[PDB]
From a paper:
Nop9 represents one of three distinct subfamilies of Pumilio/fem-3 mRNA-binding factor (PUF) proteins, along with the classical PUF and the Puf-A/Puf6 subfamilies. Consistent with a role in processing 20S pre-rRNA to mature 18S rRNA, we find that Nop9 binds to the fragment of internal transcribed spacer 1 (ITS1) present in the 20S pre-rRNA. Together, our results suggest that Nop9's essential role in SSU ribosome biogenesis is to prevent premature cleavage of the 20S pre-rRNA by Nob1 in the nucleolus.
The repeats form a twisted, incomplete ring with an ∼80-Å outer diameter, an ∼35 Å inner diameter and 30–40 Å thickness. The repeats form a curved overall structure, and twisting relative to imaginary repeat-to-repeat axes is focused at repeats R4 and R7. Repeat R11 diverges in structure from a classical PUM repeat with two α helices at the C-terminal end that cap the structure. Two long loops between helices α2 and α3 in repeats R2 (residues 164–174) and R3 (residues 220–250) are disordered in the crystal structure. The most-conserved residues across Nop9 family proteins are found on the inner concave surface at the positions that typically recognize RNA bases in classical PUF proteins. The most common motif in Nop9, SϕxxE/D (where ϕ is a stacking side chain and x is a hydrophobic side chain), specifies a G base in classical PUF proteins such as PUM1. This motif is found in repeats R1, R2, R5 and R8-R10 of Nop9.
Author numbering: 50 to 163, 175 to 219, 251 to 634
Write the structure that this text describes.
């Protein structure tokens, strides 16, 4: 169902102009726009298949589908009856189907909370697709449509709607149909053979099919206690199998295979994950952890989804390697530290000793954790060009914030490192899209000694108004309302500075937030009550 004809000279002129008018959007009322869309639909009657399959017009068709009313949506839907599979396979029409299906899914939701219905129309195309599901899964365009349909039928996030119970049944029937196709009507297992299992493992790591397999393993548990597709990829018995082992060794040394395994571990039954770990990973965890681009993603997934005893076993093995892992794989290092924290600071002394040695050796005079961990001097901080903050900068910031949350030692080291900068450089951080958040992160009132608070405040308070009016700086000013607890003079100085620039501060959307959080309406209108809030805050923060 691939070719439906070419658009002639007149149709091309008309639909180009209509598309142009539609995007200029000069209509003065929604009613005018709807009427114009209707005029487009009227001209498209009998030509819809040509229009969705032509590169020139397929995007107009998506617009129309988005802009028309419910009744028109239904008519456009039925105009595709009998060719859904061919359209799903089409380079341009498949994207039209996706737009259609997503809007249709939203319509069955309100059709549920209140002629032939959208629900029944949707079921008709599902039944038309059922004999093609296997071909779709392997089709470079139709696999995306299949994947979207499974997302819709399982009520998951589309490019999240509630669904009829008929949808839950369709999910079951679609996945079961696919299941019978990838077996041979085996009817148990067994007799599923290798190479049928091997052929399915090949799809598992196939560029086209693999995202569909992942999603299926992810949702099949909604209606299948036995996890049939999970069992198709992996075994369930209590001992190793040679073929499963070689496949596992491939996944753990292959980028797609590792990300596949990483994703399905989060949705597998716990005992199935414990089994893969026990049989194929536990005795080689350190070796796997050192594979930055492959196996390490799997080790991280184990740390996030296994139970306490196994997680601590992995930590026993990987924590001694933490400094070395941090050399090339900071994201993994962050998750290891995070997991140690979640497991009650497990191996804390070893983690801390290593991080101190690597980022803040107490024998070094040049020591500064902003420099060793954020590479501050070589960063985009203070650049005169229009350089946004980079991905590496955000990564290093997230790592440092994790350290600050791990132990007061790193909070105190970070603050000392900020106080060690030239004052201008620390202020620059306050305006930086990523490093500002690091500044905000150290403003933890009950964890920072009052002398340290005074010293930070001596610096920040000079920039009170400009920080308050800034998109990043205003979060810092918000934190300073609590950070100045037990420091009334500092709180009074900042409040006074802001009120002196009342109009400039309230002209900023960020400033108005600070104004609210600093309760400055009270400061101005009912000073006695403001002063009372300050007294109460003190005992609320420091009881």
């Amino acid at each position: 169902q691939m070719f439906f004809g070419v658009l002639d000279r007149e149709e091309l002129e008309y639909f180009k102009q209509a598309e142009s008018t539609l995007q200029l959007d000069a209509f003065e009322a929604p009613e005018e726009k709807f009427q114009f869309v209707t005029s487009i639909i009227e001209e498209a009657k009998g030509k819809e298949l040509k229009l969705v399959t032509s590169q020139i017009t397929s995007k107009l068709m998506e617009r129309v589908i988005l802009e028309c009313d419910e009744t028109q949506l239904k008519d456009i839907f039925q105009s595709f009856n009998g060719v859904f599979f061919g359209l799903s396979c089409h380079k341009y029409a498949s994207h039209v189907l996706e737009t259609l299906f997503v809007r249709s899914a939203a319509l069955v939701e309100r059709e549920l909370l209140t002629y032939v219905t959208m629900e029944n129309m949707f079921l008709f195309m599902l039944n038309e697709l059922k004999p093609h599901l296997k071909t779709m899964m392997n089709h470079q365009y139709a696999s995306h449509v299949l994947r979207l349909l499974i997302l819709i039928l399982s009520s998951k996030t589309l490019p999240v709607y509630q669904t009829p119970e008929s949808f839950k049944s369709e999910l079951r029937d679609i996945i079961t149909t696919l299941y019978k196709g990838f077996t041979n009507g085996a009817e148990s297992r067994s007799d599923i053979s290798q190479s049928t299992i091997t052929k399915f493992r090949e799809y598992s790591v196939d560029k086209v099919a693999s995202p569909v397999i992942q999603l299926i393993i992810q949702v099949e548990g909604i209606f299948d206690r036995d996890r049939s597709f999970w069992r198709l990829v992996f075994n369930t018995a209590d001992e190793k199998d040679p073929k499963e082992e070689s496949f596992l060794e491939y996944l753990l040394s292959d980028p797609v295979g590792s990300h596949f395994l990483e994703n399905v571990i989060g949705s597998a039954r716990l005992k199935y994950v414990e089994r893969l770990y026990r049989l194929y990973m536990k005795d080689r965890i350190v070796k796997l952890a050192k594979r930055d681009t492959t196996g390490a993603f799997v080790v991280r997934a184990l740390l996030e989804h296994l139970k306490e005893k196994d997680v601590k076993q992995i930590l026993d093995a990987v924590v001694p390697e933490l400094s070395m892992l941090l050399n090339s794989n900071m994201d993994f290092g962050t998750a290891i530290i995070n997991t140690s924290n979640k497991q009650g600071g497990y191996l804390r002394d070893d983690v801390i000793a290593q991080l101190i040695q690597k980022y803040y050796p107490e024998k070094s005079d040049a020591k500064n954790i902003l420099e060793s961990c954020l590479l501050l001097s070589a960063s985009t901080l203070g650049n005169t060009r229009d350089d946004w903050p980079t991905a590496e900068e955000r990564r290093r910031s997230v790592f440092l914030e994790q350290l600050i949350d791990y132990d007061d030692k790193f909070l105190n080291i970070t603050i000392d490192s900020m106080l060690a900068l030239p004052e201008e450089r620390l202020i620059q951080m306050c305006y930086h899209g990523v490093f500002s958040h690091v500044v905000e992160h150290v403003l933890q009132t009950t964890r920072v000694d009052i002398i340290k608070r005074k010293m930070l405040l001596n610096i920040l308070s000079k920039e009170s108004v400009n920080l308050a009016c800034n998109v990043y700086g205003s979060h810092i000013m918000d934190k300073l309302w609590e950070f100045t607890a037990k420091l009334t003079l500092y709180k009074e100085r900042i409040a006074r500075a802001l009120v002196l620039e009342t109009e400039k501060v309230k002209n900023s959307i960020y400033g108005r937030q600070v104004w609210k959080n600093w309760k400055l309406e009270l400061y101005v209108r009912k000073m006695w009550d403001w002063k009372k809030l300050i007294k109460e805050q003190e005992f609320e923060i420091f009881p």
